[PDB]
Amino acid sequence: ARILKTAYTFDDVLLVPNKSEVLPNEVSLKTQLTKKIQLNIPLMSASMDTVTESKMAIAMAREGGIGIIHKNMTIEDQAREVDRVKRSGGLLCGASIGVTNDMMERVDAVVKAKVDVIVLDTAHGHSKGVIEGVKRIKAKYPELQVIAGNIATPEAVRDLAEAGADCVKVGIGPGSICTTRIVAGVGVPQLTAVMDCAEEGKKLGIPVIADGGLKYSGDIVKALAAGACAAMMGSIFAGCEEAPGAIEIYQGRSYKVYRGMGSLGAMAVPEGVEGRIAYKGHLADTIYQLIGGIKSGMGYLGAPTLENLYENANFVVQTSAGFRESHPHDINITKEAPNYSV
Amino acid sequence: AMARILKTAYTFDDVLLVPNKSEVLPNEVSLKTQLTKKIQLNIPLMSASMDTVTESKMAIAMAREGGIGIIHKNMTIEDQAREVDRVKRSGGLLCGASIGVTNDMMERVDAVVKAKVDVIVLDTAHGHSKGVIEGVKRIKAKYPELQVIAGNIATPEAVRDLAEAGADCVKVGIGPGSICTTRIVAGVGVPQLTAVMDCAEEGKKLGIPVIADGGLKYSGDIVKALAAGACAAMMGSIFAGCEEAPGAIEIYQGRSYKVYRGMGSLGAMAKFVPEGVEGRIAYKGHLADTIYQLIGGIKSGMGYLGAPTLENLYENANFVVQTSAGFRESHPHDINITKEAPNYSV
Amino acid sequence: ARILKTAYTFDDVLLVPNKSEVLPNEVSLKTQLTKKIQLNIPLMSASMDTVTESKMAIAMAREGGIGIIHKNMTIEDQAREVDRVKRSGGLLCGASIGVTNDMMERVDAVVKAKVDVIVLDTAHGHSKGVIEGVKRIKAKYPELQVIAGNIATPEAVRDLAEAGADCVKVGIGPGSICTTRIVAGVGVPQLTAVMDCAEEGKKLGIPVIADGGLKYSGDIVKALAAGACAAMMGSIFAGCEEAPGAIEIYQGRSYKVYRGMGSLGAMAFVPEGVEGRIAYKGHLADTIYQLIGGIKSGMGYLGAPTLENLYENANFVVQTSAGFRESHPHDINITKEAPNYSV
Amino acid sequence: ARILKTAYTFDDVLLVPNKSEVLPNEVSLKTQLTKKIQLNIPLMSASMDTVTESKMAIAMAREGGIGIIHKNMTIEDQAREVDRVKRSGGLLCGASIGVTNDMMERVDAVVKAKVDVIVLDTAHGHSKGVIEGVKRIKAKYPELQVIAGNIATPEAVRDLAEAGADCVKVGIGPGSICTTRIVAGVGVPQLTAVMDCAEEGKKLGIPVIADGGLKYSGDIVKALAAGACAAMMGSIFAGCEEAPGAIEIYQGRSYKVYRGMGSLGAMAFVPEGVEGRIAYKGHLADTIYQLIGGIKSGMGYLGAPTLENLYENANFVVQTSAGFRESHPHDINITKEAPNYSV
């Protein structure tokens, strides 16, 4: 039983600027989610019953990303949801699958609805059940694109790619609503997890998704510079108008419900919590700020594409003092900024 | 010889366990552990020997759940014997008794032995001392088969010296306790994760187990202590609010509290300078409900690490260090929690 | 994509005392801003529309420093502001230029008004547009002093010096109103940025400016010890009577507006700064006095009669968060105002 | 410019327990302040106008420690305070001296009043003025015990010893009222400073004093285990009945005034201390009882029956801020007062 190293999250690191011949308006955000699936922007919405149904997925895809329909619903309803996204323009769409008895039955129905990718998502992706589930899926549907998660190690990338996954999803414990690391003691701070896993995926030719723990646009730049093909978010999108759930008002402020899929409410021992986040308005305005920040970061790094970003990215580690310097400090902020908050 | 800085030492909140390949489900794992070579526990949990934590009611409840309680010694010799006696006659449950380094030490041990106590815990502020080492030797001479836990310690050298004195198990923890001020008033101690790991390593070489005593707040902390090599975890704070702990239920402004205090606090010693504090913690209802959450957390952690057994968990556990920013990410963040979780509190 | 090292900001480090044969009242604060421009004190006011117009630049220069007139104005008005400064005595003045379609005509205007230095300043100075800008300016006005920024790597120092910069300005992300590091993920903790850049500039013969993130006089000492020729500040000066903006009273205290140049309000669409209020400080002279006294104190502690000697002989140690807590006052209820400390 | 290392303060480290054969009550706390001055306990009260006059110095002496009479009075009044302590019986007394034009005058007076040790104390002890001052005092009074400070490096230990000091005082910037590190940028976290200076002093046979930054009895154990012959405290004693100043009441709480001597108030150029108020803590003997109890407890944990053995067998580990949270009480609503713990 040994200590391997210090592992870092997004707030621990910064990207060093490079020489740049490209302006933020000239960079391309295109990325391959699998070898067969290109996104126009590297963003995905979490498959949670408070984040992504057909309305969110349609909106994500029109912006050039993708939404993964959650599976806290009957098989027929999830099929319906996928079908509505597919009929709204041949937009891309995903569907969540669990390691369950009816797993193949749920897969058959979202395939019938012509889902583009299934996400075999589970608390612990580096497990025999997930490995065998991927092998059953790829044996019946060899061309069906499969994302498997969640994981946090190069060995997990290796075993899941060996099983036939086309993409793997990284993140054990970083979610805003997640208590996995506290109740089970397990996880890897997300920037080191993505860096280590994406480096392994690149050697195998399998992309990785940086899933969870993202709070600012600059976090996504770091996830992409570390080598993730795409970034998945629940918190950043669950307050948008297109997220499921009504808008609630409490003492002058408008909120939407957001909860972990492993919380008591979502399941009705838990590994998530349930709560409220601020109402953000329409997805478009959030995406515009996220993409603007990504384009700026890429301008700072001289990267015209996502791959060039990864190839020339150098991180430095900052201390808690450096974190205090990186945020605004020693000012009473009195005007809303659209891409910042405390 | 000169003073030196050895290394950085870590507490539970500093580290995370890296997930392994798993072929085991949380409900398939076994929590059986050897507290000593002759005492098996069904779950690796112990309740602390404090006068706000463990008497008969608590020890009975702990044994029923598969753990064990250590009856505290802020008690006449006779009362402690009767406390042990009630646990033994309550269905043959395991029971332990706390013993200090006192002039009547052997008279206290005699009485709990007669009450058929299964283990005695010679616990004191500084276990790595001549008084403790001579006391273990005296007990193992009069009672060669009596199981003896000695503590508290924090170094591998202390494991060896107490193992050579004849201890069957050593208890690790100088300063991690919720109510403890040792490190602040005396400047002494070792962050608990590193203390458990370095002592467990030495104990494994010698074949003596180590207990991780103090500083546990969440079920995931227990997983880290077991993964660092402890055979069992000892908790005061987590159990002091349970209905089975001593003390009445106090209500102040809509919340329910129970008293919890260090054995080295002024109040506990009136019943020197103090090395503990006195206060209140939340009432938690029945012990069974807390243990359920603890065991569930432990089983989930073993599932993530691919460990069907506690020895497999130690053999394959890998830790990473996280910063304070990583700690912020590990807890729920950027959310207004509006519903209680039964295993997470703020 | 890899991790280079840990990088430090000012609060991460402390300077070790040296043997001293000099009293703080004997040190000299002269610095070469460029080869041609000497300042009597190594302080600059930021080129921001809530910090430096002519009033601020005139006071900074009378105190021995310099102000950089911001460019959130028409070309004509910026020339008029520089001209106000030059007509108010022998006063040094600077003017901010950006990478814009009308860049050279803005430079022509400020040159005609007799500006002493232009600051070609933009979010990312290590860029082809800044490099081409410096070359174009130097090709037309070979003797005009050019500061280029902002940057944070030794490679950018070398490229901007090769382009013909006379001085480079270091700082990506540290400013009190800046969100660059949060929104784009990019920056270098400022003490390490200044140290690594100044060392490259020393080898090349080009000075560097420590711009941004400075809060106390001690911070400036650390910036200068790390090799910067001068320190540039916005927050420390924006609350002064000579900065732009009225004085606002609210619940018994006095405030002034301070905002990033990349905030929505300054720009009037993804901002890299915020907008807010800071305490009114009174006259520039009194803040400068405290700054100077603290710098002179630090040079006393390090035995430095000059700023070059301070840099040549300074050693740092890293402190933890607990060391930070010990470095500030602690375990006291402060009941009297200190003119050079506040919580 | 170069970063030498990470430097640590008391909150950054913990001492590893040793095998012990000694109970706390059996421990001996005697120490050599200098080769010719023994204290029954290794505690000194700071030479500050809010901590030690004769009332404090006499009380420190009766407890086994010693007070340094502060210098913020006339030469005549300081000798009177020294004389009053020395006529109260066989009590030890120190007196503070500065690098002043009347330095020798003030030394003459306190020497006439039979002071036992002088403390040539200044902001920056590793300076020509202090080195010359020690040399002049020792050339006139070869047997006067001289403590010189304040310093933070082994080079300063060596330079001050070669000048004739009998003890050196370590501490640049750790004091609770101190702002040296914020306003001048200079200092060394105190545990590292004591350890590095104590190691040099032991090679030379000259003791060091750990001055400032101590909050709990456990911090003093760390400073002695790090090599100091004694610990000097202002904040821990300024709330005691024997400190100067009246007991002031506000909302049912009792306070005393405490201020740095580089604060504006004490100086009545640029300040390096703050002014404020701390809790009233009653008679000094109550506080000393708790300090000595905690020290004896720590030496029990370290198997040190006496103090010389302590440094030789002291092993520190570094703790993170998470370890710091574990070291204090946590997850408890403390409802009873503890005599040796507060937050």
Ligand SMILES: C=C(C)c1cccc(C(C)(C)NC(=O)Nc2ccc(Cl)c(O[C@H]3O[C@H](CO)[C@@H](O)[C@H]3O)c2)c1
């Ligand atoms: C996103 C989160 C956190 C999550 C989402 C929904 C529910 C949960 C709950 C609260 C139910 N918690 C677990 O489910 N915890 C868990 C822990 C360890 C293991 Cl080993 C495990 O099972 C693995 O093996 C199975 C077969 O491959 C497959 O279920 C896989 O997860 C599950 C967590």
Ligand SMILES: C=C(C)c1cccc(C(C)(C)NC(=O)Nc2ccc(Cl)c(O[C@H]3O[C@H](CO)[C@@H](O)[C@H]3O)c2)c1
């Ligand atoms: C002080 C700050 C932060 C600042 C000040 C004013 C405005 C901005 C705004 C909000 C407009 N943000 C950027 O402007 N962000 C940005 C990011 C990356 C690049 Cl690559 C970039 O462009 C570089 O290339 C161009 C040609 O050299 C030149 O404009 C140069 O800055 C600009 C920031």
Ligand SMILES: C=C(C)c1cccc(C(C)(C)NC(=O)Nc2ccc(Cl)c(O[C@H]3O[C@H](CO)[C@@H](O)[C@H]3O)c2)c1
């Ligand atoms: C859980 C805690 C902290 C604790 C629990 C109850 C009481 C105490 C008190 C406040 C009384 N504090 C000590 O007791 N402090 C102490 C410190 C150093 C030594 Cl060396 C020491 O004595 C050792 O040597 C003796 C013979 O082996 C034996 O008493 C052993 O403890 C005791 C602490």
Ligand SMILES: C=C(C)c1cccc(C(C)(C)NC(=O)Nc2ccc(Cl)c(O[C@H]3O[C@H](CO)[C@@H](O)[C@H]3O)c2)c1
């Ligand atoms: C405890 C503190 C902080 C302290 C105590 C009282 C007064 C001061 C004031 C506020 C006046 N601040 C300094 O005095 N600051 C200072 C800074 C650098 C140097 Cl180099 C210096 O003077 C050195 O050179 C002289 C010749 O020996 C000698 O006086 C020595 O101190 C003094 C500080």
Ligand SMILES: O=c1[nH]cnc2c1ncn2[C@@H]1O[C@H](COP(=O)(O)O)[C@@H](O)[C@H]1O
């Ligand atoms: O309750 C749960 N426990 C742990 N992780 C969860 C839970 N529910 C969702 N997640 C993960 O957390 C991510 C959202 O993280 P966020 O973007 O920080 O809010 C999802 O994409 C899932 O990977």
Ligand SMILES: O=c1[nH]cnc2c1ncn2[C@@H]1O[C@H](COP(=O)(O)O)[C@@H](O)[C@H]1O
């Ligand atoms: O007063 C004391 N001072 C220091 N440690 C104590 C004191 N009383 C009990 N302990 C220890 O603290 C443990 C409880 O830690 P907790 O589970 O963090 O509350 C006990 O099992 C003892 O090992």
Ligand SMILES: O=c1[nH]cnc2c1ncn2[C@@H]1O[C@H](COP(=O)(O)O)[C@@H](O)[C@H]1O
């Ligand atoms: O909005 C902006 N975003 C990022 N940096 C800015 C912005 N506006 C001004 N700056 C920089 O911040 C410095 C002021 O930093 P301060 O002294 O910490 O307030 C200026 O000199 C500029 O270098």
Ligand SMILES: O=c1[nH]cnc2c1ncn2[C@@H]1O[C@H](COP(=O)(O)O)[C@@H](O)[C@H]1O
């Ligand atoms: O104002 C000052 N500036 C810096 N240090 C001071 C000042 N006044 C007193 N000191 C130091 O601080 C010590 C007191 O530290 P305290 O015990 O932390 O309050 C004194 O013994 C002096 O060494």
Ligand SMILES: [K+]
């Ligand atoms: K900033």
Ligand SMILES: [K+]
């Ligand atoms: K989390």
Ligand SMILES: [K+]
């Ligand atoms: K201080």
